[PDB]
Design a protein around this nucleic acid. Structure first.
Ligand SMILES: [Mg+2]
Ligand SMILES: [Mg+2]
Ligand SMILES: [Mg+2]
Ligand SMILES: [Mg+2]
Ligand SMILES: [Mg+2]
Ligand SMILES: [Mg+2]
Ligand SMILES: [Mg+2]
Ligand SMILES: [Mg+2]
Ligand SMILES: [Mg+2]
Ligand SMILES: [Mg+2]
Ligand SMILES: [Mg+2]
Ligand SMILES: [Mg+2]
Lengths: 258, 164, 167, 138, 99
RNA sequence: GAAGGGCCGCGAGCCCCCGCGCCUGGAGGAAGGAGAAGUCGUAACAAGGUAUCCGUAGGUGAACCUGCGGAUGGAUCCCU
RNA sequence: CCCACAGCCCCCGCCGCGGAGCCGAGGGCAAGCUGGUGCCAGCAGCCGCGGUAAUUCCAGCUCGGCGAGCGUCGCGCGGCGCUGCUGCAGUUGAAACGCCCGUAGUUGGCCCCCCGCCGCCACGAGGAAACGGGAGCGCUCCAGGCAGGCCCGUUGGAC
RNA sequence: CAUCCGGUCGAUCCUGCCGGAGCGCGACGCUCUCCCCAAGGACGAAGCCAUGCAUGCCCGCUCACCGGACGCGGCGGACGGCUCAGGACAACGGUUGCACCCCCCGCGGCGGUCCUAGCCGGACACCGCUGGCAACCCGGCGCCAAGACGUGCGCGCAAGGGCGGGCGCCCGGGCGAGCAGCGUGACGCAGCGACGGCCCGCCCGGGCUUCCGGGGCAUCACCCGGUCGGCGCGGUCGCGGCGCGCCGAGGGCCCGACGCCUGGCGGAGAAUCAGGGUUCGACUCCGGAGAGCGGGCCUGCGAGACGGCCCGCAC
């Protein structure tokens, strides 16, 4: 029974969707606390070193971050272990590359290059409405951001559009049947579909049923259902519109690419 | 601990349960002579591979034809066999696999493929030249007698350009 | 030292359980404050550093407190005279020890200073004309460093009056 | 039948097997513990002791020796296999003693012998029998 | 009491039959379930005892069926409170009744 | 606000008594096994020279004998 | 070339050591002729050999198995349907209580088409990897690892 | 990847066991040409230890020497590494909950403080002079710094306490659930403030908790007496016989209690191989416990810490 909090992370005990190599080393980076937690995030160095290949070692990534060449929602971050999460903005001005962090059909993080018209905001999921000091209403989001004095019409599990420049709401999407959603956890991560039923069980989890555009149907709990607009997506999405292929189709694709 | 602890490892052959059996000894010596086998471990390796293929084929055959897993695994196995030249091209049904024999495995060894091309006098001569790096596959030279050639690579086997 | 761990107890069947670790600081305890009514003298309160850096204060001596008359909504600061009843033990009463639930006598001056004539609850007015008023303690000394309460009335007043009358 | 077969009878079968598996001699020997405490080797492949006395339907006198285990201090009897190997063994000498083919039971026509000598003074007995090693240090 | 007191029901709701009602405001509840043994491909009948608090609003004898809800620790062995009682006739046969 | 002191609380170590578990000496007594080519007799296998065996009780150098009741695994599948 | 520096692998030149042991030959179990010794010395997991040809001891010749490995000792699984759920036996080989009543326990004929609950079957959600299985890839092959060429599914690391 | 063989007889058929034939883990013996991978004082001594190393970094404070020393201050040292003694309704694995809880860094908010501010006060460290002592250790006098210490300019604000909904049940800040916040009457002036952060939310982590699983012996058959429950207080971050006082008597057991034993850390897993299974599981990942034995404690958000202190015992 450890006397205090943990600071290390063994490579084998790291999350699977990070795709770390077994023999790369004994250790893995331990993300620091921030907007996203350990199991729904990814350290900055992994993106800067094992994905874009701009750096070959820890020291290069540290130097780059100190030089303040990377922006995360308009605020330069110098922490090599800063956690990056879903619906983030990842812009590198010195190479005119701007990406949005999303989930692929396989259930992994991806960078979707975006335009300037939609790179000044982000979508947030509201999880809690509480009264703070002096009875002032508040709200919290999945990225650990608190807003004061919100519109009464906003309820839990809704989606919020906040401008990055200032940090103010402009519009919100209600949680209802017939609204396009994206799955952010479980066996169905990265899929896109439309809500068709909402079944609530007293004292336990609420289940959400959605249908894929092709006609497929799948189930998931409400804790990882993310509205990304009405009917049509508000933001850009990867090339494939959240359609998971079968093993046979994936094998055909692999053989074609070989 | 050391990263070397996570490396995998395994044996590659099976020994007979009954060692002394006259027909088995005769057959093994016969095969060793025809294919110039260094020792009796190669036969055990061939038996191991054949057993693996046979078990996979059995497990797949126990199921219905229109089973997604059956189609997937049968297609993979047949493609592998066709690419490796163990099974003939015209055979595409899973049943033909269970009748295979280790002679088919042996016939695709490098010594055999160079001997059938008339490039060597005998299997022993082939082994002697192979050990002396005088042969090449495609653009690369291979000095392992047990190296297995693929069907698309059979016609690209030649004598090493740098060989004297 | 002092602990509230359950590892030193028997099981529901009466068996003895084995000791599989040493003592831990999560499960510690401390000696009671035993707050004493005053009746080098003065109010004394101590501070305790609890887990997480939080601060807890136990009173060792005190003499005053705030008491509220709910029916008429009259609250004043009064002096406590002495303890007269306790439902746990007579020894606490003899020693004049203050705890939650103690029944005490407070001075009547603050409440007779006004509304001694207004037609309110008769059973309280007679007490007001005297010198002491029966009251009860609602706070927890030893945790917050205060001894507050309320003036009795209703069935509980009759209960305690009958309890302490024959004595 | 003669065995319980109801759908809710797992407990009875479990206890029956538990009780009746103790009747097998081998299982008792292996999982009872008496053999472990009685065996001089204490479950080891072989032990080390000290020589203290050289002694002797087939009518063939056999050569053996008395040993005293160092780690256990008890006395046992060990047999010297090869031909003419007794000369290599001297009174009050350290030996390494192993078991016979059968674990516990006597082997062959030797009465009450269950141990074998294999090394003497740090040199293999069989090696000395073939003259591979020599005992000129002793 | 869960109705007039200061406790809250939260967690698991279970059912069982009354085993003994001798304490002041508490009882013992009997639960029955099945355990499967893979080696013999058969089952075993098992039971556990669960202690609960019984408020005066309910009247209970031995053999009745009760519904218990989970609450915070009330004592050394009690973490449940009775919520519903379904009377059973006395003299009825004791039977294995999983719930 | 130091040294020091009083009462309680956590609680080491030692003394005393009790219990449990495991090894272990002992005059003498008695059991089993192996070894030898010992002495005394022949109890069983044939109706083994008194048919054999079971339970119980008594007796005798030893095997064993006798009484009461039982079985055939007997030496009889067979008689107004 | 690599390496923190040194090795090692690999590549280019000149010169150039080719070395097999451990068990056994009566049976189980594949593999047989001379000389000694004479129930002695010794072999032998078991059966057994040895008291003048010893097919079994000690030696030479020859032969057999595995092979850069072979043999000996102890333990576990298998052999073993000799622990028996699948799947033992109970007249005579070991083994049906002297008989009856009887609680706990186990097991309980047939019948209502559609309701409730329990077991059951199928599917699904949620939940670490590593190991295991498994798609693809020529570390010269292999044990392995998650890579590589170019015009790369957004290359891939699916499940 | 469903196999049998020799041995009771003058011969024959059975039961039944003895032995052989295979794989794996270790030790011993003989022997060994080249390359690649690779375990390595665990096995009733958690027995005893010379010798060297294993935890530092720096923004703040320079009249030191020529700015680098040193020192005060800050963060870290509670992670990592080793082992398996103890412990058998416990640890542990899966599944719940806190409407009984605490939480550093980091991220995002928030920021009203009752009654010299062109900027307050005194000290010690290093250092100079002077000294004790075998060593380890320190003494006395003396000018000086702060993102250190103390006081504190400031638009009322910490903890706790009294009162504020119903008339059979159900049909917003928020819930399955009367939970939060607020108003008002009394107390109390806690924290921040000489270059402004008290407070709130998330996050990781911890504490306890629901259901199921969790070794052997019946030459252990009855066991427990804070043991079972209730009332009240205290203590705790917090619920709770966790402790104390009073009251009543209960609780567990052949569906195996209690007791005793273990050469007992658990799981993910490993060996073996028709199918069904048997044995093991010190060691790579997770969780737990410990640092000679037994106890106690300071600092700190976090330790009953041992490369932190105090005591007894043995060395
Ligand atoms: Mg006779
Ligand atoms: Mg006679
Ligand atoms: Mg007769
Ligand atoms: Mg008989
Ligand atoms: Mg019989
Ligand atoms: Mg002021
Ligand atoms: Mg200050
Ligand atoms: Mg132990
Ligand atoms: Mg660990
Ligand atoms: Mg510790
Ligand atoms: Mg300590
Ligand atoms: Mg330490």
């Amino acid at each position: 029974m450890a006397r205090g909090v943990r600071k290390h992370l063994k490579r084998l005990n790291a999350p699977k969707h990070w795709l770390l190599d077994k023999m790369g080393g004994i250790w893995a980076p331990r993300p620091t606390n921030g907007p996203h937690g350990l199991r729904e995030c990814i350290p900055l160095i992994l993106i800067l070193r094992n994905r874009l290949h701009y750096a070959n070692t820890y020291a290069e990534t540290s130097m780059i971050l100190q030089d303040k060449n990377v922006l995360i929602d308009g605020k330069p971050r110098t922490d090599p272990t800063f956690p990056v999460g879903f619906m983030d903005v990842f812009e590198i001005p010195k190479v005119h590359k701007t990406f949005r962090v999303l989930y692929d059909v396989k259930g992994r993080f991806t960078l979707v290059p975006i335009q300037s018209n939609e790179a000044g905001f982000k979508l947030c999921r509201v999880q809690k409405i509480f009264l703070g000091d002096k009875g002032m209403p508040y709200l919290s989001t999945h990225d650990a951001r608190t807003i004061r004095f919100p519109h009464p019409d906003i309820k839990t599990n809704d989606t919020i559009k906040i401008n990055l420049k200032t940090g103010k709401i402009d519009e919100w999407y209600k949680f209802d049947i017939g609204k396009i959603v994206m799955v952010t956890g479980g066996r169905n991560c990265g899929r896109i579909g439309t809500i068709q039923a909402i079944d609530k069980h007293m004292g336990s989890y609420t289940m959400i049923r959605m249908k894929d555009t092709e006609g497929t149907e799948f189930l998931t709990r409400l804790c990882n259902v993310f509205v990304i607009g009405n009917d049509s997506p508000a933001v850009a999405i990867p090339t494939t519109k959240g359609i998971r292929p079968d093993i046979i189709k994936n094998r055909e694709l692999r053989l074609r690419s070989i | 601990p050391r990263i070397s602890r996570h490396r995998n490892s395994s044996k590659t052959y099976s020994t007979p349960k009954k060692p002394f059996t006259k027909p088995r000894l005769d057959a093994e010596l016969k095969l060793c002579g025809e294919y110039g086998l260094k020792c009796k471990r190669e036969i055990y390796r061939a038996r191991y591979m054949l057993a693996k293929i046979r078990r996979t084929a059995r497990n797949l055959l126990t199921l219905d034809e229109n089973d997604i897993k059956r189609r997937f695994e049968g297609a993979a196995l047949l493609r592998r066999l066709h690419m490796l030249g163990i099974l003939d091209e015209e055979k595409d049904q899973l049943d033909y696999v269970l009748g295979l024999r280790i002679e088919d495995i042996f016939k695709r060894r490098l010594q055999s493929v160079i001997v059938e091309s008339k490039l060597a006098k005998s299997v022993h001569h082939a082994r002697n030249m192979i050990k002396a790096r005088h042969i090449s596959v495609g653009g690369q030279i291979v000095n392992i007698p047990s190296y297995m050639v693929r069907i698309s690579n059979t016609s690209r086997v030649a004598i090493a350009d740098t060989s004297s | 030292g002092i602990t509230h761990d359950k590892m030193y107890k028997r099981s529901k069947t009466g068996a003895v359980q084995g000791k599989w670790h040493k003592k831990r600081k999560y499960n510690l305890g401390r000696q009671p404050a035993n707050t004493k009514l005053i009746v080098n003298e003065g109010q004394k309160i101590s501070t305790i550093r609890c887990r997480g850096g939080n601060i807890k204060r136990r009173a060792l001596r005190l003499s005053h407190g705030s008491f509220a008359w709910g029916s008429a909504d009259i609250s004043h600061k009064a002096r406590i005279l002495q303890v007269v009843y306790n439902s746990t033990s007579n020894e606490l009463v003899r020693t004049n020890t203050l705890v939650k639930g103690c029944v005490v006598q407070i001075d009547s001056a603050p409440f007779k200073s006004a509304l001694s004539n207004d037609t309110l609850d008769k059973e309280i007015l007679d007490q007001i004309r005297g010198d002491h008023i029966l009251a009860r303690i609602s706070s927890r000394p030893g945790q917050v460093g205060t001894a507050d309460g309320y003036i009795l009335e209703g069935p509980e007043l009759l209960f305690y009056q009958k309890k302490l009358a024959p004595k | 039948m003669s065995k319980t077969s109801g759908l809710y009878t797992a407990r009875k079968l479990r206890t029956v097997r538990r009780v009746n598996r103790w009747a097998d001699k081998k299982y008792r020997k292996a999982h009872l513990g008496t053999w472990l405490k009685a065996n001089p080797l204490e479950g080891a492949c072989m032990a080390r002791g000290i020589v203290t006395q050289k002694i002797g339907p087939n009518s063939a006198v056999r050569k053996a020796v008395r040993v005293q285990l160092t780690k256990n201090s008890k006395k046992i009897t060990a047999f010297v296999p090869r031909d003419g190997s007794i000369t290599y063994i001297d009174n009050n000498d350290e030996v390494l003693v192993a078991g016979f083919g059968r674990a516990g039971r006597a082997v062959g026509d030797i009465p009450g012998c269950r141990f074998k000598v294999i090394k003497v003074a740090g040199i293999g007995l069989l090696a000395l029998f073939l003259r591979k090693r020599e005992k000129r240090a002793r | 009491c869960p109705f007039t007191g200061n406790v809250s029901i939260r967690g698991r709701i279970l059912r069982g039959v009354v085993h003994s009602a001798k304490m002041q405001r508490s009882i013992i509840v009997r639960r029955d379930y099945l355990h499967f043994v893979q080696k013999y491909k058969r089952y075993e009948r098992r039971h556990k005892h669960v202690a609960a608090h019984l408020s005066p609003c309910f009247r209970v004898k031995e053999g009745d069926i009760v519904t218990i809800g989970e609450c915070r620790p009330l004592s050394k062995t009690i973490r449940f409170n009775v919520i519903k009682v379904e009377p059973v006739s006395e003299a009825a046969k004791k039977r294995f009744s999983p719930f």
